[PDB]
Design an enzyme around this catalytic site. Sequence first.
Site, PDB file in Angstrom:
ATOM      1  N   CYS A   1      44.127  41.326  43.049  1.00 55.46           N
ATOM      2  CA  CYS A   1      44.162  42.518  42.217  1.00 55.46           C
ATOM      3  C   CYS A   1      42.982  43.429  42.497  1.00 55.46           C
ATOM      4  CB  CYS A   1      44.252  42.153  40.747  1.00 55.46           C
ATOM      5  SG  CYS A   1      45.676  41.107  40.355  1.00 55.46           S
TER       6      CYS A   1
ATOM      7  N   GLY B   1      43.388  36.735  42.795  1.00 59.88           N
ATOM      8  CA  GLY B   1      42.172  37.321  43.340  1.00 59.88           C
ATOM      9  C   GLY B   1      42.420  38.615  44.101  1.00 59.88           C
TER      10      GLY B   1
ATOM     11  N   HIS C   1      42.447  44.715  33.547  1.00 59.85           N
ATOM     12  CA  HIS C   1      42.655  43.320  33.144  1.00 59.85           C
ATOM     13  C   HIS C   1      41.532  42.391  33.653  1.00 59.85           C
ATOM     14  CE1 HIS C   1      45.206  42.619  36.870  1.00 59.85           C
ATOM     15  NE2 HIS C   1      44.324  41.620  36.934  1.00 59.85           N
TER      16      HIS C   1
END
Lengths: 304, 304
Positions: free
Chosen positions: B145, B143, B41
Site C-alpha cells: 500500500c 506492505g 489507513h
Amino acid sequence: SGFRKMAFPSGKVEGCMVQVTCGTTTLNGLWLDDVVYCPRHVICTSEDMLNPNYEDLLIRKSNHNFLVQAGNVQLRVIGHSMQNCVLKLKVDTANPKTPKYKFVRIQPGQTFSVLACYNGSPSGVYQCAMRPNFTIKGSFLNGSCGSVGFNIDYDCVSFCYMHHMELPTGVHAGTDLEGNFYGPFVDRQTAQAAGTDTTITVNVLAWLYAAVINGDRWFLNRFTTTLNDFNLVAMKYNYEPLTQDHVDILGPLSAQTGIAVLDMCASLKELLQNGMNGRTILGSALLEDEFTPFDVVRQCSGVT
Amino acid sequence: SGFRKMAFPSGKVEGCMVQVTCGTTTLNGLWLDDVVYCPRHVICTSEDMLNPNYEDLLIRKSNHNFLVQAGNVQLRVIGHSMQNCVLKLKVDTANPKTPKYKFVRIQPGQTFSVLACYNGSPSGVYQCAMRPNFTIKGSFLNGSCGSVGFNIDYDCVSFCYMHHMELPTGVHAGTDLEGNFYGPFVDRQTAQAAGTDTTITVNVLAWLYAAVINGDRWFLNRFTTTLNDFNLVAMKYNYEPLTQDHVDILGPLSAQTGIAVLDMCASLKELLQNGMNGRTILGSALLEDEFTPFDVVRQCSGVT
Ligand SMILES: O=C(Nc1nncn1C1CC1)[C@@H]1CCOc2ccccc21
Ligand SMILES: O=C(Nc1nncn1C1CC1)[C@@H]1CCOc2ccccc21
C-alpha cells in the site's frame, strides 16, 4: 495477491545509458566506471552491414570519431577496443551513477528486464526470456541497439544482454556484455533463421504454481505422471524436456502449495492435451513461460 | 519491431519512495517536495479496519508518531493532515530527487505504470489499466500500500494512482493523489464487490493496429461494419461501446496502416464471434485491452 509480468525497477540502469554516434550511426551505450560498451556495428554504414570486416572498418576509426553524450554533456573518449561484437570506449570520467554490477551470460529459459532506449534515453522497461533458440522477443526499433537486459540482486545489477539486431522474422538477437552473441547469430545483414522456439517447461510449471498461490485453481486435476511420461507429451508439444534439476528447482513452490511437482506436471499434461476450453489462468489464454521459478518466488514474497 | 507490455522507466519514481510507519503498520509513502503522501489507513490496527472513524483515530496521532524513512535516513515530520483517503505528512526537507510532476485523475481505459514497493523499496514495475469497473488487476502483497501508478511525458511524472487495498475477489482499489478513490470503494474491511469488468474496446482496436504494424495480419478480413452494428456485438461480448470519439482517437493508427477504423471493428467483430481458433496475435491468445491508442503510437515510434 495478483501476479504480473514485472520488470526490475530500471533507475540503476537508466543512470548508465548514453548515446554513441559514429559517423551517420547513433545507438545506445552502457557507461559503467570509465568504459562505454556498445555494439561494434555502430562503425558500419548500412552498406557495410552486408559483409562487414570489423577489424578493417575499425582501423579507419580514431577515439575522436566516437561521439559519446551522457544526458546533454559530451564525454571524452581516450581509448577504444573491440571485444568480440562489442566496442569498449574508455572515457576520461567514471560514471558517477555506476551501480554495483556484474556481467553474466545467461542460459536459455532465464528471464531479464530490458530498458529499451533511443539516443541514450530510456523509453520503457519490459520483461524478456532468453528463448531456447537463443533469440528474445523484444520491442526494438531503429536506434534501440545497445539497449541492455539485466537482473538485480538487491543493489547489484547483473547485465546479461545487449541488443544488436532484428532477424527477418521479427525476433531479436544480441550478446552478453563480453560481446559474445547468444546462439549462432552474427552481426551481419544476412539470412539468419532461428531454430525451434520451444516452450520453457520449468517456467510454465512455475507459473502454474503462481496461479495456485494467487487463487486460480481450476486446472488442478486428480492425476499424477512421471518425468518420462510427462516428457513424451512435452516432446509432442514442442516443450523443453523436464529434468530432475528442474524438479529440484520447483521444490520450494511445491512446498508452499502442497502440490507435488509431478502432480503439477500431470495438470500441465492435461492442459496441453485438452487445451484451455476458453478459460484463462492468471488472465492468460496461453501457458506463460517467461517467469522462472525464482521470479515466481521473488514476486510472491515481495523481495526488494 | 516487436510489441511488448512496456512500463515507463521507473527511476524518477524510485527517487520518491519512502517508508511510512505508524504504530505497528508500515507501508509506502510518496515524497514530493516537502510532503509525503500515504494511505490514511496507515493509522489503523487490523481491528480498526472493520469500521474505522478516521477523523477520530487521527486525533490520537501526533507528528512524531509518523515515522518516515527515506533510504536509511529518518525524515522529520513537522505537520500532518488528511485529504480524503490520503495523509499528507509535511517534512522539514524537500526531496532533492523530486521530478517535475502533476497529480492527475485518470478515466477508465487509461493505462499507467505501477512501481510495486515494500518498506519504501521498489520491487518491480508493471503496466496496469484502470478497469471500467474502477479496479486494477495488480500484483500487491501486504506492505505494498502506498505504491503509486504513473505516466511520464518526457520529464514530467503524472501520478494517477496510489494503492490502498485488495477486494475479496483479488482485484485492487486505490485513489488518485488527492485521496479520492477510483470507483465506489472505501478504505474499510467490508464487503465490496466490483461491477462488470468489461473489455476496453478502443484499446483492443489500438492493439490490433499494433499487431498489423508488427506483421501479425491473419485476422484482417474482407468486411466492414458501422458503429451501431459493431456495438450490438460489443454489447453481447461485454465490451465497452465504441464512440465516434474513440474512432477519432484511432485516426492516426488508421492512417499509418491504411486500415479504416470500421474495417478493424469488423475484424474484431469476427474475432469475437469466431474466436482465435488456437491462433495468437502478438503472442497472446486473448484480445489485449491494456494498451491505449497513445501507448501504441508511443511504443511504435520510440518516444523517450
Ligand atoms: O537489425 C538491425 N537493427 C535493429 N535491431 N532491433 C531492431 N532494429 C531495427 C528495426 C530494424 C540493423 C538493421 C540493418 O541490419 C543489421 C544487421 C546487423 C545488426 C543490426 C542491423
Ligand atoms: O487490502 C489490504 N491490503 C492490501 N492491498 N493490496 C494488497 N494487500 C494485502 C494482500 C492483502 C488491507 C488488508 C486489511 O483490510 C484492508 C482494508 C482496507 C484497506 C486495506 C486493507
